[PDB]
Amino acid sequence: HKSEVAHRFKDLGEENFKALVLIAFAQYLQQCPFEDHVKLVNEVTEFAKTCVADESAENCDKSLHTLFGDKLCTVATLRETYGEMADCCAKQEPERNECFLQHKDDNPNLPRLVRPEVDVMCTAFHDNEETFLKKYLYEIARRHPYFYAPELLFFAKRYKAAFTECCQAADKAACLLPKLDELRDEGKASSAKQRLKCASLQKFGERAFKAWAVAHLSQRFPKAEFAEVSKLVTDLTKVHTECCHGDLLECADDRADLAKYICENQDSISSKLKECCEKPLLEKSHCIAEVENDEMPADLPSLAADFVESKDVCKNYAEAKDVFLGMFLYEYARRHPDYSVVLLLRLAKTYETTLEKCCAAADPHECYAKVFDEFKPLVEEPQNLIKQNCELFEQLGEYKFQNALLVRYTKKVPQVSTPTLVEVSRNLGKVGSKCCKHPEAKRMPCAEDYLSVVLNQLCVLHEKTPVSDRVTKCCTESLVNRRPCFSALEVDETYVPKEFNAETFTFHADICTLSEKERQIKKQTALVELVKHKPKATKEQLKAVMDDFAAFVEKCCKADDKETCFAEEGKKLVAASQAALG
């Protein structure tokens, strides 16, 4: 009431408070050393406590934004280190704060953070647990200035948890490594999705975003009333706009409020929101965002009734087009938790194009009467791709399955870089093992989820170093045609093969002493290079060469003479393979 600091402190807790103030300052002062931030934190915490003791103590009446800027402008090397950002201190709130956001480098130049040795980490953890964790919290925060702090805190705790369960294990590494790898990928996925939603909100605008949300929200709260789903979509759109602007405090309050609204109207939204709503402030939002779908009414009518059979469908559509179409989505989405959001968007879009070119004819009721018949092929395209790809992934394993995609895409866009093809193919292979293990009912939503970051990752790279108009075409089409576009790419007939290169196909006995991750990437790299040299090769001709190669390695990484074997037998493979592939 009288003191925000005092208040946030009381219901956030000392520990969470100290850690968030740390992440907050590291995201602006990305250049100050660790021991400098630790001091700031302690000082702010000391302040907070003074206010808890007495709401009226000096300065406790001021706003968090104001206290934040005042403290930020206290750094004596501000102008010398950050330069232009110091000029912000000459302004007044909201301008000052507004000025600080602008001068926050989204991608600073800091060395990549390397992962030390399990023993080195575990001993550091043991000795001084807090500094070990806070120093890494600091290193991650300054590198990801836009990552929602509370979310970064949630990750820190999963990290602490892994060091507790693995450093006391007989085989530490066997325990820790696979956990760290999973956290990293999950951390990277969360980040990509975060900056992806803000990008879309910018390019395509509110309407398309609201569309996306309606479908999404009604798949999870199928029992909610449309007016409820609209209310939430409105607020959810306000929250994302605010959070994307980058203002941590504003973003936080809007999320708290929305989490508050939801729990209070719980029975009217979903039955699966119990746990989430009994959780502490800091977690409510996060929990709710990951909540599972409630179950649908089962006593639901049929779409064709109100959207195809009704005679005054155009009368309702002309009165308020977006609301009606919004109704369509809501109706269609909550009967299909198994459709990907884009699929539902693709349907609404198609329904829209019909109402437009039908409500402007003599007899409307017979112009659009066959709409649902046009949904069939849209629905089946994504499904058939799943079964066809998940089947193939069963035959081969994650590794061989990746080799197939590799051959398939290299032929699609040979122009693309070998290391990029390998990376994309490896991720697509993962998505296959992460989503095919689910029952048909959850596959499509899963694939949509993983394919969106992977395809946006792809487009970004091609954004920097464009190499194909086709990839750029698919990359600049709507977020609803993005995937169908890539799925429609065909073999590159125009492509002219690369000239042979002995070097590129010469293997020394180093691959013998390499890890699984190294051997594969080394084989997969050669494979792509193989396709780029002879693009007209058959799956047969190819499978044959890979066959000679498989053994070839074994026969040199199991012989009394490493290098010699690899150079003698290697000369024989290259020559024999060249003649095979003509």
Ligand SMILES: N[C@@H](Cc1cc(I)c(Oc2cc(I)c(O)c(I)c2)c(I)c1)C(=O)O
């Ligand atoms: N290319 C990296 C590995 C990597 C593979 C995938 I596939 C991926 O994408 C997702 C998407 C979602 I959605 C998840 O929940 C998760 I976990 C990972 C990411 I980011 C990274 C490397 O080898 O360096």
Ligand SMILES: CCCCCCCCCCCCCC(=O)O
């Ligand atoms: C609550 C009102 C929002 C509903 C708006 C319905 C829009 C349906 C069209 C599908 C959106 C795809 C985006 C686009 O192509 O513009």
Ligand SMILES: CCCCCCCCCCCCCC(=O)O
């Ligand atoms: C011009 C012919 C050069 C021959 C080079 C052969 C390179 C093919 C490597 C493919 C690796 C197969 C992968 C595997 O066996 O698991």
